[PDB]
């Protein structure tokens, strides 16, 4: 029952962070932290999928394996150089009784996107830059000012999380340019990604203790990010380790649609698998504000319109599965409920605040999350419901993502507002 209709998830075993996101030779490649052995983390490989359109994924062979039973191929990114695909990633060695973990940054190449070959001079970065650095991982490499730039996650002195910057002319030899950013709120920053949108430098990164993806927007000057604006990339309970695609026009992000904090609460394990990826979102800047919306390609999933109303009420939906999109335009306040006789998720706009309640959603319960929002003359909520998730998008600007595990189809919809226009689209199963 819980296998997603239109989100990416592994054929078996455990999946976490998206890796190596790249548009290369006309297709979107997605890799991921993978354990095929069982639906729990360990013995980490890079799984591999591809799509033409960011939506219709096809599984490919596992791309990268650890050399033995005490290593893992941890997170990283992908780049294109001389027409070839390069993956840059953290290679991890287990601690023993006497030694802590060891992390190095390595390179692999592919001419065809199927056969992946190790670079002979690995590791490309053998050690951290300063004493007392840990969580030294997740190289996100991009092109800037005629050079390669890599941002890396780290923590210093078990005290403060920081993003490290290296540069390179060739991808193999890297120069340390210092720590560009730190966050006192955590011991470690994971999965950084440094992007440029319309004259602004935007650093996206993840923090473990809160399972959140944050951004800091401003300008990179003199080896330091000057922050003008900070915020969350997603306001729900299950969005983590976001990464951006190399090689696209738009800034397109995918995150892991799960939380480490809530992982032991989830039931997909009983079906032999764990982990889901988020729908892709476009990041853009308007009126000096970072905004987040669903990627346009998701429109291709719409297979039929099953319901529409221009009035408040409670409605029986002619749907047989939890695989659908709500598009709702409204003025002022709203309460929107989706569910059945025993379960529901509720979203409410009340005055100044958007609030989402998944506590009664299904067999994993849920939580309440809230954000202050700006009113528009017409407000818009777009909701994607799949077998074990709901993702909400408000005014093409803010996103809330949640894992839920309903025991039954959410075939009851109720809306209350003035000037309501609401429609429901059945969404395609991408697998069969
Ligand atoms: Na190589």
Swiss-Prot record:
The family annotation for this protein states: Belongs to the glycosyl hydrolase 32 family.
Q: Which domain of life is it from?
A: Bacteria
Q: Where does substrate bind?
A: 14-17, 33, 41, 74-75, 92, 137-138, 188-190, 208, 260
| Single GO biological process annotation from the record | carbohydrate metabolic process
Q: What Enzyme Commission number(s) apply to this enzyme?
A: 3.2.1.26
Q: What lineage does the source organism belong to?
A: Bacteria, Thermotogati, Thermotogota, Thermotogae, Thermotogales
Query: What Gene3D superfamilies is this protein classified in?
Result: Exo-inulinase, domain 1, Glycosyl hydrolase domain, family 43
Q: Name one Pfam family in it.
A: Glyco_hydro_32N
Temperature optimum or stability note: Optimum temperature is 90-95 degrees Celsius. Highly thermostable.
Q: What is catalyzed by this enzyme? A: Hydrolysis of terminal non-reducing beta-D-fructofuranoside residues in beta-D-fructofuranosides
User: Where would one find coiled-coil regions in this protein?
Assistant: none
**What is the name of the gene encoding this protein?**
bfrA
Q: What's its job?
A: Hydrolysis of sucrose, raffinose, inulin and levan. Specific for the fructose moiety and the beta-anomeric configuration of the glycosidic linkages of its substrates. The enzyme released fructose from sucrose and raffinose, and the fructose polymer inulin is hydrolyzed quantitatively in an exo-type fashion.
What protein am I looking at?
Beta-fructosidase
What does the UniProt keyword field contain? Glycosidase, Hydrolase
Name the residues annotated as catalytic in the UniProt entry.
17
Q: What is the effect of changing residue 190 to A?
A: Loss of activity
Q: Does the keyword RNA-binding apply?
A: no
Q: Does the keyword Zinc apply?
A: no
Name the InterPro entries for this protein: ConA-like_dom_sf, GH32_Enzymes, Glyco_hydro_32, Glyco_hydro_32_AS, Glyco_hydro_32_C, Glyco_hydro_32_N, Glyco_hydro_beta-prop_sf
Q: Which GO terms describe its molecular function?
A: beta-fructofuranosidase activity
């Amino acid at each position: 029952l819980f296998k997603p209709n239109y989100h990416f998830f592994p054929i078996t075993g455990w999946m976490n962070d998206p890796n190596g996101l790249i548009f290369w030779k006309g297709k979107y490649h997605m890799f991921y932290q993978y354990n095929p052995r069982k639906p729990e983390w360990g013995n980490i490989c890079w799984g591999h999928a591809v799509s033409d359109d960011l939506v219709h994924w096809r599984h490919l062979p596992v791309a990268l394996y650890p050399d033995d039973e005490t290593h893992g191929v941890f997170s990283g990114s992908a780049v294109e150089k001389d027409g070839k695909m390069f993956l840059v990633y953290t290679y991890y060695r287990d601690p023993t009784h006497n030694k802590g973990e060891k992390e190095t940054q390595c390179v692999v190449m592919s001419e065809n996107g199927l056969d992946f070959v190790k670079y002979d001079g690995n590791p490309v970065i053998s050690k951290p830059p300063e004493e007392g650095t840990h969580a030294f991982r997740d190289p996100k490499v991009n092109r800037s000012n005629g050079e390669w730039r890599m941002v890396l996650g780290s923590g210093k002195d078990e005290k403060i999380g920081r993003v490290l910057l290296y540069t390179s002319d060739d991808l193999f030899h890297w120069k340390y340019e210092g720590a560009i950013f730190e966050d006192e709120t955590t011991k470690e920053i994971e999965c950084p990604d440094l992007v440029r949108i319309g004259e602004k430098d935007i650093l996206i990164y993840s923090i473990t203790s809160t399972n959140s993806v944050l951004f800091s927007m401003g300008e990179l000057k003199e080896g330091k990010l000057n922050v003008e604006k900070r915020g969350l990339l997603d306001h729900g309970t299950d969005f983590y380790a976001a990464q951006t695609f190399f090689g696209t026009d738009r800034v397109v992000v995918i995150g892991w649609l799960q939380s480490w904090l809530r992982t032991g609460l989830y039931p997909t394990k009983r079906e032999g698998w764990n982990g889901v990826m988020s729908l892709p979102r476009e990041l853009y800047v308007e009126n000096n504000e970072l905004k987040v919306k669903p990627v346009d390609e998701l429109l291709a999933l719409r297979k039929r319109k099953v319901f529409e109303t221009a009035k408040s009420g409670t409605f029986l939906l002619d749907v047989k599965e939890n695989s659908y999109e709500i598009v709702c335009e409204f003025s002022g306040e709203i309460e929107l409920r989706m569910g059945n006789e025993s379960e529901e998720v509720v979203i409410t706009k009340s005055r100044d605040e958007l609030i989402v309640d998944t506590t009664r959603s299904g067999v994993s319960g849920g939580e309440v999350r809230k954000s202050t929002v700006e009113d528009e003359a017409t407000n818009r909520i777009r909701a994607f419901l799949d077998s074990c998730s709901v993702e909400f998008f408000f005014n093409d600007s803010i996103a809330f993502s949640f894992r839920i595990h309903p025991e039954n189809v959410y075939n009851i919809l109720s809306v209350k507002s003035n000037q309501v226009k609401l429609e429901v689209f059945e969404l395609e199963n991408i697998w069969l």
